[PDB]
Amino acid sequence: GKCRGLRTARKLRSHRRDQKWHDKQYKKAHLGTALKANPFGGASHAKGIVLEKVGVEAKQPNSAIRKCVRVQLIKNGKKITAFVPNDGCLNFIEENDEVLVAGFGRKGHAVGDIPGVRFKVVKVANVSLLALYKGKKERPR
Amino acid sequence: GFIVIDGSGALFGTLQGNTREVLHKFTVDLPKKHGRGGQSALRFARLRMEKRHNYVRKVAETAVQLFISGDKVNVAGLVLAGSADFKTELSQSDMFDQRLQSKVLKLVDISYGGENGFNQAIELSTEVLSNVKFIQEKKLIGRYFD
Amino acid sequence: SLARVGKVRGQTLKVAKQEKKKKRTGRAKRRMQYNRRFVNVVPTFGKKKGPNANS
Amino acid sequence: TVTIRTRKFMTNRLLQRKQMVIDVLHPGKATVPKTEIREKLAKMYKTTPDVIFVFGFRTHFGGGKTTGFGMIYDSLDYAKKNEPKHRLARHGLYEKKKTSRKQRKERKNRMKKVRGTAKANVGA
Amino acid sequence: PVARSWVCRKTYVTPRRPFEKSRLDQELKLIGEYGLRNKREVWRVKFTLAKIRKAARELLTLDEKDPRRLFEGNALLRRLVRIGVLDEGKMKLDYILGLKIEDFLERRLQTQVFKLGLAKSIHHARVLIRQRHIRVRKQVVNIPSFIVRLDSQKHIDFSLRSPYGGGRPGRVKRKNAKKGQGGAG
RNA sequence: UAGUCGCCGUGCCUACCAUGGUGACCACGGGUGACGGGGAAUCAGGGUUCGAUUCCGGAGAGGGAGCCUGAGAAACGGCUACCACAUCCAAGGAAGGCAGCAGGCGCGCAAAUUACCCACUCCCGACCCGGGGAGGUAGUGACGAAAAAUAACAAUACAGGACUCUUUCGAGGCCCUGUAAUUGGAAUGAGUCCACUUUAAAUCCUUUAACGAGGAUCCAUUGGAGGGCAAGUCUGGUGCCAG
Numbered sequence: 025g026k027c028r029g030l031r032t033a034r035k036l037r038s039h040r041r042d043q044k045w046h047d048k049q050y051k052k053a054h055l056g057t058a059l060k061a062n063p064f065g066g067a068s069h070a071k072g073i074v075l076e077k078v079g080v081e082a083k084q085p086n087s088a089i090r091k092c093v094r095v096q097l098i099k100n101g102k103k104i105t106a107f108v109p110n111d112g113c114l115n116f117i118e119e120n121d122e123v124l125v126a127g128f129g130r131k132g133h134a135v136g137d138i139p140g141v142r143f144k145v146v147k148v149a150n151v152s153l154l155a156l157y158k159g160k161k162e163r164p165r
Numbered sequence: 166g167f168i169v170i171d172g173s174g175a176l177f178g179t180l181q182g183n184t185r186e187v188l189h190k191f192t193v194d195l196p197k198k199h200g201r202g203g204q205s206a207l208r209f210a211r212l213r214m215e216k217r218h219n220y221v222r223k224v225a226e227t228a229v230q231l232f233i234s235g236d237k238v239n240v241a242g243l244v245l246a247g248s249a250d251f252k253t254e255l256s257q258s259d260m261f262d263q264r265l266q267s268k269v270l271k272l273v274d275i276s277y278g279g280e281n282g283f284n285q286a287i288e289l290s291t292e293v294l295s296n297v298k299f300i301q302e303k304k305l306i307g308r309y310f311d
Numbered sequence: 312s313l314a315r316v317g318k319v320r321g322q323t324l325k326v327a328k329q330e331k332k333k334k335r336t337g338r339a340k341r342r343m344q345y346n347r348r349f350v351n352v353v354p355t356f357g358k359k360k361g362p363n364a365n366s
Numbered sequence: 367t368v369t370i371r372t373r374k375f376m377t378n379r380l381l382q383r384k385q386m387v388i389d390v391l392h393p394g395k396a397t398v399p400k401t402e403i404r405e406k407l408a409k410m411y412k413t414t415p416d417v418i419f420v421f422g423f424r425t426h427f428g429g430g431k432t433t434g435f436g437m438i439y440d441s442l443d444y445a446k447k448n449e450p451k452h453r454l455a456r457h458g459l460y461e462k463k464k465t466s467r468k469q470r471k472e473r474k475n476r477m478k479k480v481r482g483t484a485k486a487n488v489g490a
Numbered sequence: 491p492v493a494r495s496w497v498c499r500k501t502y503v504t505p506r507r508p509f510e511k512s513r514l515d516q517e518l519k520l521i522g523e524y525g526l527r528n529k530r531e532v533w534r535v536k537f538t539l540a541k542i543r544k545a546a547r548e549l550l551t552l553d554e555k556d557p558r559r560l561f562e563g564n565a566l567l568r569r570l571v572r573i574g575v576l577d578e579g580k581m582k583l584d585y586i587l588g589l590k591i592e593d594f595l596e597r598r599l600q601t602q603v604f605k606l607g608l609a610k611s612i613h614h615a616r617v618l619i620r621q622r623h624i625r626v627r628k629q630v631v632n633i634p635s636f637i638v639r640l641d642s643q644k645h646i647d648f649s650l651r652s653p654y655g656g657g658r659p660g661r662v663k664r665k666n667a668k669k670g671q672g673g674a675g
Numbered sequence: 676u677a678g679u680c681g682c683c684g685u686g687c688c689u690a691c692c693a694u695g696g697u698g699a700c701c702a703c704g705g706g707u708g709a710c711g712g713g714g715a716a717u718c719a720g721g722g723u724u725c726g727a728u729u730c731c732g733g734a735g736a737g738g739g740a741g742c743c744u745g746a747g748a749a750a751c752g753g754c755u756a757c758c759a760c761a762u763c764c765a766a767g768g769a770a771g772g773c774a775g776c777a778g779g780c781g782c783g784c785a786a787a788u789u790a791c792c793c794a795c796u797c798c799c800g801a802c803c804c805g806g807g808g809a810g811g812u813a814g815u816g817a818c819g820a821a822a823a824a825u826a827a828c829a830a831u832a833c834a835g836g837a838c839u840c841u842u843u844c845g846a847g848g849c850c851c852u853g854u855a856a857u858u859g860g861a862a863u864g865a866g867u868c869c870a871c872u873u874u875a876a877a878u879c880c881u882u883u884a885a886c887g888a889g890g891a892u893c894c895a896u897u898g899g900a901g902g903g904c905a906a907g908u909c910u911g912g913u914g915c916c917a918g
């Protein structure tokens with residue numbers, strides 16, 4: 025503070041109330057455009073259909089072909105590049121199957137090589153992708 | 166695609182030009198009509214129709230899962246199938262999607278409920294899959310057996 | 312390209328896992344660990360080598 | 367090898383009876399049954415064992431002490447006149463009816479449905 | 491609307507730094523000494539201590555001759571002297587800051603039993619206690635954590651209903667006696 | 676100012692006069708993913724966010740409106756309309772509202788058995804006698820809290836360490852600590868399971884006979900091992916490929 029007056033409570037509080045908005049994160053929390061724009065709409069997971077398999081190329085120093093997958097959500101209809109992680113797990117993901125998608129730990133921010141891919145697959149057809157990779161369970165056919 | 170319903174159990178299967186495929190099948194323990202007499206029998210048909218509709222909800226959910234793709238069908242045709250008016254509840258149900266009602270290709274009755282009935286419902290389809298060589302074969306070999 | 316999916320994990324040699332003596336558990340296991348820290352060894356000169364330090 | 371002291375004993379002037387928590391000592395064995403307990407209190411209290419109704423014993427953990435509440439009524443006629451239905455069916459001399467509560471309710475509404483003489487025909 | 495309590499809380503708090511090498515050392519030293527099952531078991535003690543130090547500061551911070559401070563301090567003192575940590579001559583809440591966890595861990599029953607010598611090891615002592623082998627003033631004790639007051643410390647001995655006590659042998663001697671007897675004939 | 680209504684005071688309403696009232700001390704208007712409070716989470720001290728939710732107060736039973744009956748209702752498990760939606764007809768007609776309990780459809784990432792009882796607590800009624808999906812009791816339930824098993828001991832070897840001894844290496848063992856698929860018997864539930872108790876009738880738990888453990892095979896997991904960050908330069912495969 026600078027006005028250390030005994031009766032400037034109002035003037036102070038007002039000033040604070042104006043400047044909280046210049047903080048980028050508060051504005052992020054309280055204006056709705058971010059929450060609405062986010063397809064997750066303040067959610068951890070979201071279900072969606074696989075419609076095509078895509079090999080997105082990595083950024084520099086690194087060099088790799090990341091295996092992503094174009095899902096279309098049911099509730100909104102928005103389109104997402106959900107990335108499948110680990111080794112040999114893509115042969116499992118068949119086309120036209122429901123997968124539960126989650127975030128990527130960054131709250132609206134791209135991560136490393138995969139440019140603009142904030143989402144990863146957890147399940148396939150009520151079957152944990154982990155269980156398929158480990159070999160505990162099998163795909164129902 | 167093909168959905169096959171029965172009080173016994175369901176079955177889902179696809180159909181290429183020549184090849185016939187099977188996607189999924191399942192069971193549900195829907196308890197039967199006798200259930201419990203005297204006390205329940207009068208209010209049995211009402212509770213049972215609710216439970217049958219719940220089975221219908223599960224079948225409906227499978228058709229959305231399969232035949233819908235972002236509220237838009239990816240597979241071209243969808244042949245619903247069942248006996249005792251199972252398919253009609255699936256057709257007219259509100260869970261069944263409207264963009265899909267636009268493209269309801271056909272509903273088909275069967276007996277016993279299953280793969281042979283799935284095949285028969287294809288035979289009722291026949292005229293619907295006129296472009297397919299499988300249908301032209303079905304018709305030609307039908308005359309050859311005649 | 313999408314040709315190379317699942318190459319290496321597969322081509323590696325699927326070796327069967329060998330059997331081992333079951334490890335002690337619980338309170339007793341923690342006791343043993345304490346003992347391997349303090350009560351067994353005696354003071355030694357220099358820098359201490361790690362538990363799994365092999366060479 | 368049983369021993370029995372009394373606890374919180376009291377003289378009720380309004381039912382003219384005595385009531386007390388029976389502190390038992392019973393090392394090395396299960397909760398002793400009520401039939402024997404009643405005969406033995408009967409001989410304890412110089413009263414017939416017909417009237418002594420005792421209940422709610424609970425053996426403590428460790429196993430050398432149960433605790434159950436007890437009271438002794440002046441007559442059989444007065445006790446039967448003014449005693450719980452569940453506490454007689456404990457023994458069997460009384461026996462509650464075994465018609466389920468929902469079936470009584472369904473009876474009530476089924477009788478509630480029809481007017482007139484058919485009421486008699488309502489019961490089966 | 492229901493007839494229930496729903497009053498419960500966590501009894502402990504985890505440490506703020508997870509991989510202090512000195513901390514790991516300390517928890518292991520104390521484990522080795524007293525035969526505990528895990529680290530939570532200690533930390534819940536750390537929580538009780540946290541409560542004690544925080545209240546102790548509150549009374550020291552109050553003005554002297556506060557009737558609240560005197561009564562509350564003397565009650566805390568009653569509990570500590572009863573357990574028999576501080577001496578009744580020694581009772582004054584400044585010494586609580588010069589005070590350590592080991593004195594409270596000393597009055598656990600597994601330790602007090604090994605110190606008494608009636609158990610070979612501290613771990614054996616634990617196995618006995620959990621095996622319901624011993625009693626205290628006609629009360630069977632299943633729980634090793636039981637804080638023993640000084641009054642009830644002296645009266646520990648074997649139980650009468652026990653294979654070790656004057657009673658029937660346990661399940662294994664039942665098997666070894668029945669099996670060995672059958673081996674005889 | 677004078678009346679109307681109303682149980683009274685008042686633009687509550689009617690008529691006649693006067694022309695006032697609020698505003699940078701943020702009115703007015705718009706928003707609120709806002710029923711309120713008692714409280715919860717977090718914390719050095721200051722503070723920050725949350726609080727539909729078992730206690731209190733408010734409002735509401737498809738949408739709005741209107742009313743009889745009553746001490747008390749603008750009642751919704753009472754009526755009458757219009758609107759929205761639904762059910763049968765012999766064609767004239769009939770009947771409707773789970774934001775009560777169970778259960779169900781639908782939405783979804785997302786949520787339980789159409790169970791038993793007035794025996795406890797209280798309530799209603801003309802009541803010593805009736806009723807109570809309020810309530811209680813069981814079933815499911817890894818939202819979470821408390822305690823606590825999955826081995827302990829001895830004797831033999833060995834490696835070591837305080838002792839005597841020994842030039843070291845070794846020797847003597849009152850002392851030990853650890854280890855050794857080397858033996859030795861001692862001890863337990865979990866469970867199985869007679870019998871009571873429990874309790875409305877049961878169940879669970881506590882007590883108790885009889886089986887129930889030597890690798891006490893009655894097989895404890897999840898994540899990690901360059902740094903951040905406790906912890907393999909061990910071995911084999913791949914070679915900017917896969918990850």
Ligand SMILES: [Mg+2]
Pocket residue numbers: 713
């Ligand atoms: Mg308050």
Ligand SMILES: [Mg+2]
Pocket residue numbers: 731
């Ligand atoms: Mg309230």
Ligand SMILES: [Mg+2]
Pocket residue numbers: 732
């Ligand atoms: Mg209020």
Ligand SMILES: [Mg+2]
Pocket residue numbers: 735736
């Ligand atoms: Mg309302």
Ligand SMILES: [Mg+2]
Pocket residue numbers: 751
């Ligand atoms: Mg109404």
Ligand SMILES: [Mg+2]
Pocket residue numbers: none
């Ligand atoms: Mg109703």
Ligand SMILES: [Mg+2]
Pocket residue numbers: none
């Ligand atoms: Mg009502």
Ligand SMILES: [Mg+2]
Pocket residue numbers: none
């Ligand atoms: Mg509703």
Ligand SMILES: [Mg+2]
Pocket residue numbers: 793
């Ligand atoms: Mg009652």
Ligand SMILES: [Mg+2]
Pocket residue numbers: 776808
């Ligand atoms: Mg209820």
Ligand SMILES: [Mg+2]
Pocket residue numbers: 903904
């Ligand atoms: Mg790090």
Ligand SMILES: [Mg+2]
Pocket residue numbers: 905906
């Ligand atoms: Mg390290």
